[model samples]
Target chain A: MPRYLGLMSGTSLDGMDIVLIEQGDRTTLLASHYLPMPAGLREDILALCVPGPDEIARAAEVEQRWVALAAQGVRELLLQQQMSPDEVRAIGSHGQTIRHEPARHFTVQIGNPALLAELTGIDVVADFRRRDVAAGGQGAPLVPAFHQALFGDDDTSRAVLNIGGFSNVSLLSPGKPVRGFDCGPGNVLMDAWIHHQRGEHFDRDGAWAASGQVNHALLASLLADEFFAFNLPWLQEHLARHPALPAADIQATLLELSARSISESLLDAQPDCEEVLVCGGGAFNTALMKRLAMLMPEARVASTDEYGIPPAWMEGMAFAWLAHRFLERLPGNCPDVTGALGPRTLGALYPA
Target chain B: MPRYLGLMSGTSLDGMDIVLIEQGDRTTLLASHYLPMPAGLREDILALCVPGPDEIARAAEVEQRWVALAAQGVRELLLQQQMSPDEVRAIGSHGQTIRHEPARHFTVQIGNPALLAELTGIDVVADFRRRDVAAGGQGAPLVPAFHQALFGDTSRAVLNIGGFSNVSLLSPGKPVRGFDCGPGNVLMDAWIHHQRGEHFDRDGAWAASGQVNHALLASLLADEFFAARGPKSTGRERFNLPWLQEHLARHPALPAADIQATLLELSARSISESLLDAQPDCEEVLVCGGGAFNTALMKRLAMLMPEARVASTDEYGIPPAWMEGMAFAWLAHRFLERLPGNCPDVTGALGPRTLGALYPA
Candidate 1:
């Protein structure tokens, strides 16, 4: 039986993911679901992420719909198990990030958790990262501990990679401070290239790239562009100037960029890294999986399912783990022990 | 034993009121501190309350000072009691209310509780009303239950005149019914400030110097909030200066003091009429808030509602002005006790919920 429900939306702005998990000494996945964002919501979130007009009014409306999305997804996950809202312990919601300004000493993740809990009738633990920023730590590194708990090895150094709109990796070892890296483009650029060319949200299974040969010169040019990271609109006009750049060839070239950058990021950080565990949308891309395996010859590459948690569901479960820790925090302790030694609970719980 | 502190900055756009209280089965007031909101911070909040430019950044800038004022007010209360930060269990803050749009099902109160917790090293419970709003409520009149606890001996009507005025009906055998009763001193405060450059008229003396424009008063009463049903909430957002200007377009040539006098009458009848309409047979009507001391305003309420004895909550031992702050302190006490701090029937939430997000030090 599932005790906690986790909800997450990424910078890629692909709707939301719901992961229902049973917590014990080990977290057992019960069932999971994904709901894509409506075109309107995706646009509003895109606007809020940048400078906009009537910002507060726009946010309140967008956040209302955002929480509605989570509430609907939560009910669907529960329906799959014949579970009621009261049966679940709590819902840990990582609201969509509208802005992440570490230098500004604030981060904006908008969703009305109070409204979500009301709609779902379950305790909601949310606003997970900004508190860490308030505590003087970067509001990230929130999920590495979860990665360490679920994917850490006793002897071998392992890297947990999640590729979505952007890609990130967490390095886990016996005693090293868990280090993470933002490996340059993940599915975002490839998805953008495919959508603009094929009018599809993504290249389904990289079939378009399979039809063409890689343009080595353009591949080299793209790889040279990460320290030189490119924007999609500019990249579009940049590609338009070169009529010789076949659409399929550029698609093939973009995948090569992701595959090489991800591999070298680990190779340079920990060459002895014995295991490469991949999760998120990139894991479903068979072409990307094969590329990762071929690039890291020294490591055994597999999805997180090999270690027990489903690859796509890992992001959802990570936040569910956060909710578990928040409830376990002693209520009377004025200073909640900020775990430097163990799993530190994040976010506050709004009572049901 | 550790106690609790409460900070309340109302729609009044005045300042924050800090009340320190010892918590247990019963709450005992220890010390109180009042800090008038800085002019810049107040102006920013007012601007952000309406549609304006650069809202997110504007709110962030104002919140920093808003939380800072709260921390300093907390420090002064501790200093008054010769208490250290460690002696307080938590600070229950109902931050500055810039918007309470129950119609949109979103209420905005700005102040970062985590920053407050870090500043004082005391547990903090804030964003209290939104959860209730989330539970499908008006996100207001939260103090009625606290009023019941403090003055529930007999069936009575407790009126609090903040930047907005809300009345709670505490009866012998009934669910508490409370709602905002039009403008309290909000319009009067604004007109006097705009005209004479005063934050408030002393004891309604400015308004007493002028004659009431019954026509203008009637026009003001036509606002929908007055016609709205119980369990509703309002703020300056609804009864603001622009709203006054909109209604006054019909009588632009009226004397400025006459407009002020009309607002004072508007304030008195808003409360008196709401009380008579909601709990007409009640024998005692207890008043709190800065308006409790406004003699001209008080006499009109007494004259308007003849049956009930009109009196301040101080007559019953609770200092009238500080009751709202104390209610927040009591609310923090309830949350720590794992008790429900909201009235589902009053605010129209689906059920009673444990209000506020608890931020540990």
Candidate 2:
């Protein structure tokens, strides 16, 4: 069995995740690690999401630094695992997404796989999204292919929900093509609101939210976002109509916003979905999970860890599987999933 | 013999050049085309040479369109040559270089290869510079390897002057490796364009009128770039008008034509000094690039290298303009063969790792 390493830095601007897997008859996660992102590099990456002067220069410089950091992580993981770079088939690096605009037909992910390859002396597969976008697909929700491979069962349908900065659900049912798309905002609104109000990263375990009542008016106002559904013209207009609410109340409402919107999307997109397996940072929020279970009374809601894979490492594991697929010359993007013209190999191979 | 297509959009910013090559026992230039760049795109590309606001968005949009234009060139060239996409092996696209900051440890060449592959239905190999820079080399003067392959001879050495003039001396002796020296140009064109209100000073005419200023020529020769015992490099950023103005400010009375003449002198002197330093026994110098057409520059080169014979690459069978495109085509062939596209001695790559990412058709 050949082993592969997967590196991912999701949109949350949190940190880099490294997962090593061995695939023989089936895929097995051999080791995993989460390395903290340097604060300056984090700011440099976030700064790019919006317009800035001399961005290409800044981007190229930052990309070099980030590649160095990723190389460091690869070395650390290999040392910890008592392995060498040559042992791994390849490193499937999901380079940090600086910008993802599928409609514009481009998505920029900044860590240079060529530099990565030069440093680690291992093959790297990267730039996974743009090829699909170039083929007229959304170039997103890429993890669904991995999700279908791991959790799909013919006996029962499953919906795998990943709640990072944004929430996305992967639908898997017997005799039906797997489908996936962004459900709505996940930790982004809550993290932004809490960070603004309480000088904290996140509402720990949704404890802050548990203290206050859900402002239905605020919930209704947020739900009116239209990408999901509602008649409200604008969220701020509705928020203005409701005077002022306590910070906890707003946090509570935002929790409901995430839970309600996710459930609403799953129900609409997969009406017969029998179970919802949750992953990502949002799955750790006790209050958020309880709310989701309450909203979707018919389907059993559980953390993906209940089915054997840890939620925190699911995305990283999927990327490892993606790298494995890339080496096998197997199609990584599902046409039905990403809305591409057809299935195609999704990454550029940077030889070792 | 498998055929390969090479595409290049040089620092000259005039347009993209497509060259079709047939390689068997020896390399042959099958057909070539030069497509003038779209006016707006040329402006956008030149715009990125300097710092600007909202550059990333503009770069992304411009790169997409430029890639589309490159695809158009490929299509037109294939049609004119009566060939199909499958007839050629792959495309070696040297995407337009908006910045070549080797000192900063990165270079920006902006058209997307994956997008190019999608449009042309041919495997596209691009981004040939960065790996060399990563390996602590200048990531430039890449054409030297191709030059050696095409024109190298046991009895002679060759120097190719591209838009940004860089020279390579290929020695037939086994122990002595080929070397690249940066003798600058392309900036001289922009300088003249700024002064004359014309696009370019095509064919050495403007330079002929301008008598060489000994003092200005002496100062230009004094630039730190001239004497790198091993090697040195300078790009548009360092060699542009501002750099010229600083010297002019010190030597206030230097005429515009004299400045252009000094540029011509600097180029010829650099070429001569490098050849003298190498002491290659061979004296026949085959010149390639737009510089080959500059008869005045050619005269200066001949006078400087009194022992050597100077002639255009055209006389030997390849257009100087299309040599760059052919080099990229050769690079694609090198990449497909799983050979190192970069010469470790030339590009300073850590080792010969295969260059380019293959985007399947």
Candidate 3:
């Protein structure tokens, strides 16, 4: 069996996570590792997430560090599994996305896989998003198919929510038409608010937000963002090109509305779901999950952990599954789900 | 037979030359064109070759124009031949070498082939020198094999000298060893002298003062130089670099023993036979080029190789062949011949590796 390595540095600016998967109809999750992002870099990324000057001057060094971390993650994962670099066929690295301009039909991710391959001596398949977007796809929410592969049901609908900097929901409706999108903002705005008000990595347990009252008027204003209400346009011209507006209370509401927007998208795709399955960094927000669980009471909501996919590591695992597709030369993103012009051979090949 | 277009702009700062060669044992020269370097550019390049401050900034822009001129030459060649681009395979390009440090083994040749390919819709094989240098070779004088193919007689020899350069002594002694050196003050010292004095190109017709200045030839005295050994190096390092030091030795109106001395070393190995007479060195034919038109340098070269037959490239039907387009056509033939083009004794390749590369159009 061909072994494939999936590498990712999620939108949350966390360091790279590597998952190795063995291909088969039932893909095997061989092993995985999460490398911690370096200190001070989180703030650097946060600075770029908002507009800033002279940022590009610092980009090269940042890109180098990102590649180093990604290669390190791959090394650690391979070592843990007692695998030789050449034993793995290829790595599908979803480099750290700096910006996603679906409106312009482009996305920029900056880890140089050639550098990674040269360092780790393993072939890499990267630059995954642009080709998807190039072929007229929003190139967002690329994980729903993995959820369907693992959690499909003939009778019940399933929703996979990946909450990182952005919250995306994957709906596995009957016949498994899986679709997802960037709900307003996920932990990004939420954690930034908590960090601004109190010096912490995040509002863990949502204690800060729980303590404060929710202003329904502010929630309505955040939810009113057109991006939350519509699907990404297929042509290059139609992307929403969402901007990062600067109000923290509104930002928190945007985080809430992000989930609410997922709820809205799910209602549109799989209105008959008996339950929704949540996963990713967002699931750790007990307060937000509790709110989401209560908001859609007609259906039971649960973390994907109940369906046997590790909740926090769902995306990490999904990318590993995508690596399996790459190894088999099989398609990874479902064009039907992504609105991609057509299925494309995602990721480039590098040599070990 | 597959046809290939060869484009070249050499270090001499002469001009761009385009040659269309039909690949075969006897390669057909379909058509050839040379675009003269504008007077302004000849000066720009002369300045950069002996560079001062702020030269790097113009290097990129000059490279683009060089690339444009190269395409323009190719386009003219194609139009003249009455053939379409699709009728040709790829353009074998040896871009102008602006700087080359063989010891460091890094060389940069200008002409961006990607732009050429994009503009002409023909594949371009370029930066051939960098890869050869990367493979551990001097990446210079890449033409003897072509000379050998076109002019080698089991009994004869060929030597070609072009402006700012000289190479192509197909066999240096009795046994037939092919080698040459970078032996041309062609325009280098002349250009330097003109910039300081008059605007016209020089002939080595003046000289008298250099015998007075042995004390001043101090720095010019490099015993370690490869060209001094007669068959080891062929580029500016063996030549122009030393000329600068030697030029300061005496007065130009002494008619300058310095100018004659610089020009003498340039044609120093020019006897009918190489004076080193080193064994495993060849003895027969001598072919010459450059402005061998400079009668002074030619007479000295003939005296230096007195035992060997000395003749210019015109005797062989090709004149002023230093334009590089012809050298590269021979380079492509060398690749096609599967012969090790660089003599390890000459270029220091890891061994004999084929020169140049294949560019798929």
Ranking by DockQ: 2, 1, 3
Which docking band does candidate 2 fall into?
Answer: medium
TM-score of each: 0.92, 0.95, 0.55
Off by over 4 Å in 2: A229-241, B153-155, B174-184, B280-282
Top TM-score: which candidate number?
Answer: 2
Kindly list the per-residue Cα lDDT of model 1 for residues A175-281, writing each as its tens digit: 76677767878898888888777667788787777677788777776677637344478567556555577888888888888889898888788889888999888
What are the per-residue Cα lDDT tens digits for candidate 3 across B98-152?
A: 6666665455565645456545767655555543454566666566556656666
The per-candidate TM-score of the B chain, in the order shown, comes to 0.96, 0.94, 0.78
Ranking by TM-score: 2, 1, 3
Counting clashing residue pairs in each candidate, in order, gives 1, 0, 25
TM-score of chain B of 3: 0.78
Q: Write the per-residue lDDT of candidate 1 for residues B115-177, one digit (tens) a residue.
A: 787668788888889888887888888998788787775779899987778888988888888
Better of 1 and 2 by DockQ: 2
DockQ of each candidate, alpha-carbon based: 0.49, 0.69, 0.06
lDDT (0-100) at residue B20 of candidate 2? 93
Query: What lDDT does model 1 reach?
Result: 0.80
